[PDB]
Amino acid sequence: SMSKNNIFNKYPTIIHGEARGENDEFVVHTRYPRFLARKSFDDNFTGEMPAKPVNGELGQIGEPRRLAYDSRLGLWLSDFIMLDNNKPKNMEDWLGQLKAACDRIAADDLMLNEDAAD
Amino acid sequence: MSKNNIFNKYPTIIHGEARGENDEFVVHTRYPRFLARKSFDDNFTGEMPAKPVNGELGQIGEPRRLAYDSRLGLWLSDFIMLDNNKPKNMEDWLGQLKAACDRIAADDLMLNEDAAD
Ligand SMILES: [Mg+2]
């Protein structure tokens, strides 16, 4: 929806979520491609800002195979729900845009602890 | 329908924050599903209310937009409904939205308590 999308654009691009009773966290991406995702951490996760820029990978996990994002730094993005109803005209470009957004989300998450420290 | 079920995989109430904003956010993953902005009055205390949260829905600003006033300093605004269907009955839709907003406001009040305990 163009109307709905215009309302989405009045939101910050990356929203970090939490829920009572949950150790997993959450995310909302309000710019195209829009989605809601579960943000989870590996046991070894540090939360530290990395020297290199975030370069994750999109892939399939589990049985049945489901789309997941591996930040390669302990952060995972899962259970994606797309908030745009249009189907992407080109899939390869959609995967690239989704992966780039996930990399942005992971780096933004790493900024959370630093901000709290300062 | 199929997107609604993946919504069923999530907790009912999700509390959000964004870098650079003082306003907070909420995602309601049960019907009626939406994303909203959670804002606070200057004098908001966050101390648990003696009586149950009983907010009201109404219209604010010019042009008039739907907003929820918890009556305890918490506001929900800029509602983006995540269900595509239009409700058959509007006043029952408003009642369900209001009930979800009261639950969201009480859950937000519980956040501080949780951090203390
Ligand atoms: Mg497995």
Residue numbers in the entry:
A (entry chain A): 0 to 117
B (entry chain B): 1 to 117
Show passages lifted from the paper.
To better understand the precise mechanism by which AcrIIC2Nme inhibits Cas9 activity, we determined its crystal structure to a resolution of 2.5 Å using single-wavelength anomalous diffraction (SAD). Consistent with these previous observations, AcrIIC2Nme shares no sequence or structural similarity with previously characterized anti-CRISPR proteins. We also created a mutant lacking the final 12 amino acids (Δ112–123), which were not resolved in one of the apo crystal structures. The crystal structure of AcrIIC2Nme revealed a highly negatively charged surface that binds to the positively charged bridge helix. Mutation of this electronegative surface decreases the affinity of AcrIIC2Nme for Cas9, resulting in loss of anti-CRISPR activity. To determine if the interactions between AcrIIC2Nme and the bridge helix of Nme1Cas9 are required and sufficient for anti-CRISPR inhibitory activity, we mutated 19 residues distributed widely across the surface of AcrIIC2Nme. Mutation of three of the four amino acids that make direct contacts with the bridge helix (E17A, E24A, D108A) displayed a complete lack of anti-CRISPR activity in vivo while the other mutants showed changes in activity of less than 10-fold. Circular dichroism spectroscopy of the three mutants with abrogated in vivo activity revealed spectra similar to the wild type protein, showing that the lack of activity was not due to a folding defect. In addition, cooperative thermal denaturation curves and melting temperatures similar to the wild type protein indicated that these mutants maintained stable, folded structures. We conclude that the negatively charged surface of AcrIIC2Nme and the positively charged Nme1Cas9 bridge helix comprise a critical interaction interface that is required for anti-CRISPR activity.
